[model samples]
Target chain A: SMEDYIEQIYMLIEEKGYARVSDIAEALAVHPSSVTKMVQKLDKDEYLIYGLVLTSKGKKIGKRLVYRHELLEQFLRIIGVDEEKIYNDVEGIEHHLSWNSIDRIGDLVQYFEEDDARKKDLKSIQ
Target chain B: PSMEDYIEQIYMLIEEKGYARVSDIAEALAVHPSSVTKMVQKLDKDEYLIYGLVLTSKGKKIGKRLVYRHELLEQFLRIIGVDEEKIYNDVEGIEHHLSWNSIDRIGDLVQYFEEDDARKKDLKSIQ
Candidate 1:
């Protein structure tokens, strides 16, 4: 959940140069009050500064979180996961993987990408 | 978190030990006995547990599903050549979030790999 908040904040800042509590609440579908609570916690943890900007530590983690998410999404897509299911599956599984496991999955994704014959074989099974 | 974990662990204990006790659940989960008591009481009120550790029929159904989800993820991880040391933690962290639809698809992928030596070797060669 902390990762989700941090990732959202990072995206908001990138897109708009600022993040507001209301923006996070709407994006995450939580109450603004809940967003306030979590933002306070993030600030306390030094992940966020004023203007909803990420501190250097926060930027590092937020970038990792975003990369992990994209990696999982791409992996699922390569495996012929249903289009509708990809987002939910990525969301569900992303926070759970260790960096080691993510790296392993990344390797597999690369393998699939490089091997068109194998990838086609896999897609046929869907 | 506590609810699903307690149910899943209780179900496993019953399967392996023929019955579950608060002490057993506590030890297995590494939670304090008092914490187990509190959760068991909550579960009892929710109709998931009765007589302290026994699951109601409703509880058993959910527990069975949870166990299935957990094992499915474990099998998927192993099939994908994840490190054995990380498998349990990864499965535990992931099992709770996936939909049954996603779990079934993953199971299908695992089966696909399992049935094809060439593909499995290709997967392994990457590692």
Candidate 2:
């Protein structure tokens, strides 16, 4: 959705200290017109509020999306699922998994890491 | 995509039980009876199934193709260490999204695994 564009732009800016129309297109591998269309919407909403700087709310939404992707990838790998299907699967999984499921997976990872049981479980999986 | 899903279920049901019914497909997919009846009639009209509610020769060919991909995708999932439950769940969803190009690569990997396992098993038996 709109969040995809916002998230991509946030990551691009962080990586390169800038976000351009062509750069957003390149980062997402979408058409320039697609980038322009999203930028137009963001402009109306004052998101891309003049260049490389998003509104505070925009930054928050974008950060959450990037964090969500990170957690999803980490969870899948920890569970021993990885590779090309992981790339294909993560997209669908991230979008559809219930918030409850996310909480459980995230809590388990944290629960293990914050306890002595982490060493044994990590060793076994490793 | 619709053909792929229906064909896979029909083939699996037939291989295990020797028949595929409109009712069975309805139950499996949780589709309504009216919809299943309508679809069956359409398949019959299209010659994918004959009035006996059995797959025609052309229908059998397509079913085989779907089954082949399902197995390949399952095997690939196992290789990557997805748990049995998740493999079943994930493969069902993933298969629908995979283009033939991606599914074909998965088939190649499954083929490699099959041959290697067969050779290892034969060696163990001989030794």
Candidate 3:
């Protein structure tokens, strides 16, 4: 939950120059009251200012969260996952992978991207 | 937590023993009997459980999928050479989050690796 909220907050701020409570609520499909509660919690945790501005700590964590999400999505795409399933599959597995597993998957993705022969081998097996 | 775990265990127990009881679930899950009772009551209210710990059709469907998901993840982790000690924890952590599409794709990958010894060797040899 915190991961989702922070990721959304970071994206909203990047896209709009500011993230409001309603924007977060709508982005996550949660009630405004729930967003308010989480915003307060994040503020107390020093992840954001009271008004939804990210602290440096928040920015660092949120950036990594988004990167992790994208890495998993790209890995799925490289493995020939359907376009429609990539986003949901990434969301499903991203938070569950260990840091070590994520790094290994990242390496594999880079390996496949850099080598047409290896990528072709993988695809031929599918 | 209780919902999937309970459903899976109940299904396994019924398959093995022809029926499940609250005590069987408590032992299988290593939770207190009262906790099982509480969760079973909740599942019953949700129509996953009937009298005598029998699964309703809805519960059976979910339980079957959960078992399949669990096994598929285990197989995928093994194919990817995840450490044996870590595989169980990883599978448990991962099984609930995937969609069937993702699971099917993963299954294909596992099958691909399993069918060709040379491809499997190449995968392991990749740095």
Candidate 4:
């Protein structure tokens, strides 16, 4: 779906400060020709122009998923889950959580990290 | 994933106490009973029992899988030092979202971390 491409574009831009056809192709794991077709479609839809131009709505969804992914990663680490598997797990989970649930988790993670007493309580379980 | 949640709730209610009713499902989910019924109709894409029944065969299978997944996640979380209160809430959300790949890897990590490095080759292959 286009959302997959949009989300991938968001990650690539955040990391590289720009998105290129070849890079988006590599990110999407599709051929450049196929990406060429998509680029045209995306452009017409206002998601991109000659370059990686995202519409405001596209940007919003992209940022939302990225934020959810980061929050999930931080929350899992706080719970003492294994670090090596966190990225894959977070990716699998981020799309499925409601905004409300992610917000609560983000709040809990910040609360525990910010309070020394709570941080100690969290660590005691370890 | 809501399918997983609903079926799991049905299984848990039956296993923990006795019967699972529309009201019990609503109470467990903190939603109206009608919402639970709506979800069932959506998923079935199809049926209702000719006779009143505990669950359909499909329901029973999914229910068992859900229970097993919950137990594994609960145990894994406990081993990783998450507290009981957090584990209870977190597992409910997590159990529904894990990809099979993530599930297998986490299961491997749980067992691997508990072992000595005698089979270090096995560890590398897992990665």
Best by lDDT: 1
**Mind giving the per-residue lDDT tens digits that candidate 1 earns over A1-126?**
999999999888888988988999999999999998898899999997776878999999988888998998898777777778889989988988887789888877887887798777766665
Clashing pairs in 3: none
Q: Point out the worst 10-residue segment of candidate 2 chain A by lDDT.
A: A117-126
Task: Tell me the deviation in Å of residue A76 in model 3.
Answer: 2.0
Best by DockQ: 1
For A10-124, candidate 3 gives per-residue lDDT tens digits of: 9999999999889999999999999989888999999999657899999999999999999989888877888898898788778887776677677667767766886676677
Report the Cα lDDT for residue A98, model 3: 76
Worst 10 residues of 1 chain A by lDDT: A117-126
- Runs of candidate 1 with Cα error greater than 4 angstroms are A30-48, A123-126, B41-49
Extract clashing residue pairs from model 1: none
RMSD to the hidden true structure, all candidates: 2.9, 10.4, 3.3, 10.8
User: Model 1, residue B81: what's the lDDT?
Assistant: 78
State the interface C-alpha RMSD of candidate 2: 12.8
DockQ ranking from best to worst? 1, 3, 4, 2
Report how far off residue B79 is in candidate 2 (Å): 24
C-alpha lDDT score of every prediction, in listed order:
0.85, 0.66, 0.83, 0.68
What tens digits encode model 2's per-residue C-alpha lDDT throughout B8-113? 7777788878998778888887888777777777777888777646888988998888788777867765653445666666567656665564565455534543
The DockQ-based CAPRI class assigned to model 1 is medium
DockQ (CA atoms), all models: 0.52, 0.06, 0.36, 0.11
TM-score of 1: 0.83
- Per-candidate clashes, comma-separated: 0, 0, 0, 0
What's the distance in Å from true for residue B8, model 3? 1.9
Give Cα distance to truth, residue B25, candidate 4, Å: 16
Error of 2 at A123 (Å): 7.4
